[PDB]
Design a protein around this motif. Structure first.
Motif, PDB file in Angstrom:
ATOM      1  N   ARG A   9       6.624  -8.600 -54.391  1.00  0.00           N
ATOM      2  CA  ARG A   9       6.336  -8.756 -52.970  1.00  0.00           C
ATOM      3  C   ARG A   9       4.879  -8.446 -52.636  1.00  0.00           C
TER       4      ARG A   9
ATOM      5  N   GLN B 224      12.846  -1.191 -42.060  1.00  0.00           N
ATOM      6  CA  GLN B 224      13.423  -2.541 -42.053  1.00  0.00           C
ATOM      7  C   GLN B 224      13.074  -3.348 -43.307  1.00  0.00           C
ATOM      8  N   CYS B 225      11.972  -2.987 -43.965  1.00  0.00           N
ATOM      9  CA  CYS B 225      11.568  -3.621 -45.221  1.00  0.00           C
ATOM     10  C   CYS B 225      12.429  -3.165 -46.396  1.00  0.00           C
TER      11      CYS B 225
ATOM     12  N   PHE C 254       2.599  -7.403 -49.328  1.00  0.00           N
ATOM     13  CA  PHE C 254       2.669  -6.867 -47.972  1.00  0.00           C
ATOM     14  C   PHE C 254       1.299  -6.920 -47.312  1.00  0.00           C
TER      15      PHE C 254
END
Ligand SMILES: Nc1nc2c(ncn2[C@@H]2O[C@H](COP(=O)(O)O)[C@@H](O)[C@H]2O)c(=O)[nH]1
Ligand SMILES: Nc1nc2c(ncn2[C@@H]2O[C@H](COP(=O)(O)O)[C@@H](O)[C@H]2O)c(=O)[nH]1
Ligand SMILES: [Mg+2]
Lengths: 202, 207
Positions: free
Chosen positions: A56, A84-85, A58
């Motif tokens: 990922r 929430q991630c 970010f």
């Protein structure tokens, strides 16, 4: 005195750095603003090994503001909502990506802020990273250009003197570098890049 | 066959699309896969005007496929993502915002349909949680736009709304293209060869 960088140059810089960056074994990437966003994606192509998932990326934005009655403070304009991630920084190898290390302030404060995040997430779960070092967050930095000027801010000596922690694709002279994604006339931009030798350098 | 796309080609594709994307007035740009990063950042440059704030860009994985290791240097490789790995990642504040979804190519359209559906659900869930009725206060609605570099002239396995597709100020394809395999430059492990092929095929500068 402006230095024009082509897309093909950037691609190659990420290509030649990816090999030594794989030694760092990054679990995730954090790209600073508009500068780190494209380098981070190009790196990802050369970091992908057959069998292991795509890591990922970010995207964060740091805004610096001056003295206010001992240091320059930071507002987190765009940050990671770890809740929430579902992103745990604990025990991860984290690679911070930007385009240029100029005075080194952005990187210094980005690291500082992210170190704060990591520590706060570990102490929330009752982890002592000095007693148990396997859960410690390991930060690395990748940049395209590190200007050879005197810096206005520092980085940890351990990270800075290590070629497997701090990754600068090219240590460059103290000039203003024009990146291809900043250009509204890419034809002119590329002409200049080839002419200056900031293209296809291999 | 295989159509090689250069970086400079991508830049100009964003260039010729920026002025109509200004009509959509996006508050944020979301790259939904690996192909959306480069286009999203180039767009930001062309969308910038004096007295207008810099548009925010996010990367949020809403992709159905991937391609990184597979290159014929077969070429036309689309491997679906394993559900063994949980790719349910980050959330963004979508309420009252114009959102540009960016990817590189609309192929069968399953990815964009899925991404749109997910983002529309997130926004609806955020609005309800905040106590907002988006029908009584419609300025709190989330408007979605789509930008793609390439839109393939072929059958589609999933649909986007007809009203969206028909609107040049909501569905933005830089170029409607024949059904071929496009090699994007951020996927290349040999950029010299890639660029040279792109130049040979007329997939470089065009403005
Ligand atoms: N385009 C461009 N931006 C630069 C250059 N030098 C510094 N910057 C900007 O300043 C940031 C790094 O500054 P520092 O915090 O290292 O002084 C970069 O992320 C970039 O936004 C440059 O040579 N070219
Ligand atoms: N590199 C490349 N990827 C493609 C091509 N066509 C489809 N894809 C992959 O499949 C996705 C589109 O899926 P679909 O539109 O079928 O749902 C793209 O985001 C990309 O990952 C292509 O022509 N070239
Ligand atoms: Mg994709």
């Amino acid at each position: 005195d402006k230095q024009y960088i082509s897309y093909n140059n950037v691609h190659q810089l990420c290509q030649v750095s990816a090999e030594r960056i794989k030694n760092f074994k990054p679990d995730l990437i954090i790209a600073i603003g508009g500068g780190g966003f494209i380098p981070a994606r190009i790196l990802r192509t050369f970091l992908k090994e057959p069998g292991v998932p795509t890591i990922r990326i970010f995207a964060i934005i740091l805004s610096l503001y001056e003295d206010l009655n001992v240091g320059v403070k930071v507002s987190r304009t765009q940050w990671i909502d770890y809740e929430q991630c579902k992103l745990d920084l604990v025990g991860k190898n984290v690679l911070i990506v930007d385009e240029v290390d100029d005075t080194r302030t952005t990187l210094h404060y980005a690291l500082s802020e992210l170190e704060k995040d990591a520590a706060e997430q570990a102490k929330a779960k009752g982890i002592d990273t000095e007693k148990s070092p396997e859960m410690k967050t390991n930060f690395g930095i990748f940049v395209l250009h590190d200007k050879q000027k005197p810096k206005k801010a520092d980085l940890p000596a351990e990270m800075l003197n290590d070629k497997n922690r701090y990754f600068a694709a090219k240590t460059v002279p103290d000039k203003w570098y024009a990146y291809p994604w900043e250009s509204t006339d890419i034809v002119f931009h590329t002409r200049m890049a080839i002419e200056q030798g900031n293209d296809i350098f291999i």
